[model samples]
Target: VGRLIYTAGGYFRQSLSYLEAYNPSNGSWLRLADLQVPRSGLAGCVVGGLLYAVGGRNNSPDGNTDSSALDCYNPMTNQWSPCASMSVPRNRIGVGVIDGHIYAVGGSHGCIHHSSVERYEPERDEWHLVAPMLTRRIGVGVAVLNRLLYAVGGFDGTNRLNSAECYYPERNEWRMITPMNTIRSGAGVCVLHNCIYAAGGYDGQDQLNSVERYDVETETWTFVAPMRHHRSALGITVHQGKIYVLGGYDGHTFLDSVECYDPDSDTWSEVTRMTSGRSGVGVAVTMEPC
Candidate 1:
């Protein structure tokens, strides 16, 4: 992938189909093609140079609709096309790419939470079921570390979870990992500097600014510096050795403000804001040719 950061549809007032790209190099944004389906709580990942937008939910005057649809964006063509849908519709699903395949993890559809998982094969344009997580969750944060897919904390119907688990594709099984120090539902999760970082989420009682890092080698989670704002359902990605966390709900309001965390300095600082506030947004990075 290149330097361009892409943010897909999310809930502003309702689900949106908006897609936009940001260039950190010039500090500017380019509005790109819109997703075919308006969605929020979706998971985004890059596969074989294509941006894939996974399951989410859409709210309307009628009711909330859970989506099982998958859409792929071709930056070169600036268009989106439909792909194979997931077996079960999901909102706030966790997604990651491994060995060129995309994995969709736990999420909720309406009131039902899921522990089920699905893997999408790009070559076949199909999705198949995989070993499920031990606990059902929604708003789970996922990332690939050492080729293992880690599913971090999220809400499990009854409560915000502090538990963590990882999937072993080799054995097609899931193994429990050490839980994070704090409960985090809708936390921003990403890998940086050989560590998995979980930051800014709702802890069931209140919105959280607390952050933590997981050491894969030691199998432990340790507290890190907190972010400046409490956020949930935020977009996070690593860029230039820093973690950039985008807009999310602070429990009181939707946010357009962005913040970056420097692991070296153990601090969070404000960055450029988005034109519109977003919550439950999907974020990914890609290379846009000159």
Candidate 2:
């Protein structure tokens, strides 16, 4: 929330170990140390200035089960370290950071969506099982707002879902909130200016370019301006009062296109694009030292 530093996480590469940091100040990329494990389909989030790579599979999905390993990277040190592992192994999980803890939400093992949830405490370096989600999902998008964690639409292994839910940390419970107008999976989601926005995603049959917004107070969803290109498993984050949508796939092609949306004006504009297209890429934001 202070100074912004955008970091790249897992990607769809053979090695699956390349990592880099993007300096928005100068628009230059600095390569960091490679990921300890070479795997894709991982989920990542920043907590306490470190990047945490969560569950993902190795070279093959059916070759082996999902990875329980959680690795941490120190931007300042350019080094990687091991952290406590999750009890359940899952890939395509959604992660949210709040009050110094990381919440690992829905993902799948054996390509089956799971409702299980877990929380990681850095202070204790341990993972704890939390209240499971109301519905099973994989490829869900997670965001934090109003002291609550919102779990967005995803594939439930049967149908692409529009149903969204919120987990009240204080109550230690989850309740179904407003559902999106369109059912989607692998959507890009982020919270900005007190509302949640979901960008392009797959709706079972086709990859879409549609976008929608959810108001926390009104408990409703309204359509927003769609992206210039269709994307799924795209990276979405809030930086400098704007929502940035990064690289993803559009069913047939991978995308390196990046765009930003300004809520104040309710408009979308194309920004700088990435060098290479990628899907299932993990994205996180951190503050640089002043």
Candidate 3:
């Protein structure tokens, strides 16, 4: 994955526009090919230059909107094509990629939290259930390090999640990893220099500015310098030696504010904002020419 950036949003104007992209440094929005179908509350990942938009709401979040459809985008041709749909149609699922396989972890399948794990084999264009997670979570943060998939804090309907788990595909099992200091969902998860970062998300009632870190080997959680703004349903990505936290809501407002976290300094700083105020979007990074 190289140059073009892909993302999704709550509103696409006149029509259902599920995804968009822009440069983090310049902030120029590119209306890349739209999602094969429209979606909100979704997350995206790129495996081998093929982008996967997995799980999110349709028109509304009132339980009427949910998608099991798993879609893929290719930057080379600027087109999107349908891929193997998830066994369980869902929204707000955590997405991760490791060893050429894309993993769709915990998410809401029709408003019920699901911990089911599915892996996508690009060559076959198929998906297979791997292992189930211990906690049924929706809107979780997922990141892969050392071949282990980390499933972070999410909503359980009753309360926010402060716990995290790891999925071992080799063993076909899941075990608890670290518990977060705060229970939150819709946060962004990514790894930089061996540390997995968990950023802004909602904790049921209010949006949060909290940030946390997970050490892959020790499986411990530690608080980090939080973002200046509270946000949820945002998109986070690590690219070109930087960690970016993009658009989402801050309880009362839909934000276009963007921030980047610097691990060396253990701090978060504001960056250029997105072209459109968006949340519930998907993001993809590719190296191929557009």
Candidate 4:
């Protein structure tokens, strides 16, 4: 692989994905290692050579319900280990790591959408309660910009939302930030040079290619370019200044296209697509060798 490392398709993992990388120069794919367990609808994050996957909800005890179990992935060994689960069981949660700690944000339990938040210290192997989100949201898009965690658009039980917020870990609080122009859920976001770019989420009626950005310097939301395909439940991450939008669904169709947003030019373009189209996925990146 020219860049990333991952395992091949060992099984039909829905939200679950193995560690594998595409050898772009040769146009071939290889399996690196597998996840500790098969999971769908999990939030994945990478920090300090380790990948953290957090809460997800499933339909029922149908053996596929959402999980509060947190797991960590190590690229060096191609292995995964478990972490402390959240205080409450919430599916469709948002995850972000700030100052070396994981902030598990708003999600819905079977009872209702929750504003609860939790923190996981990988070194200590402990989970602690943190400040709650400003909104009781589920299926939200999460990103870190200017060392602050931004909780973007998600559903609030009765209606889809465009409300956006940012969390400050040091103060253990969240404050309202610029709201998204388009209310959405299950979108993906990544930080490139302090600018937070969000793309492709469901707006209740349809999957969308709409994209937007939050400028750290200006503290304002600006329009980037829309993606090529409509998608929701996708994951977004950054590598070499390029913003990558992963697999998602358009209500009926699961997408395999991986389009990228260029902040420099304010445009969207297509890139090599993944092998499968998946919704409710988690994504992260590491610059070092895996």
Q: What is the lDDT of candidate 4?
A: 0.72
The digit string of per-residue lDDT tens for model 4 on 1-290 reads: 01552222212334354555544345555555566655555677766777777777543334656568787766667667877777787678888888788888888777689788888887888888888888888988788876799888988898888888888777988999878878888888667887777787888888888888888777787877788888888767776677877767876766766776777787778777677666666666653344
Candidate 1 per-residue lDDT over residues 58-142, each given as its tens digit: 8755679999988999998998999999999999999999989999998988789999999999999999999999999899999
For model 3, give the RMSD to the true fold.
2.3
Residue lDDT tens for model 2, 155-267? 88899999999999998999999889998898988888878988988888878788898988888899988888888888777778888887788877777787888878878
Per-prediction TM-score to the true structure, in the order listed: 0.97, 0.93, 0.92, 0.89
- Model 3 / residue 231 / CA error / Å: 0.3
Task: For candidate 4, give the lDDT of residue 60.
Answer: 31
CA lDDT, candidate 1, residue 281? 87
Best by lDDT: 1
Better of 1 and 2 by lDDT: 1
Higher-lDDT candidate of 3 and 4 = 3
Clashes of 3: 12
What is the C-alpha lDDT profile of model 3 across 138-216, one tens digit per residue?
A: 8889998888888899887667798898877788888987688788888888888788888889887889898888877
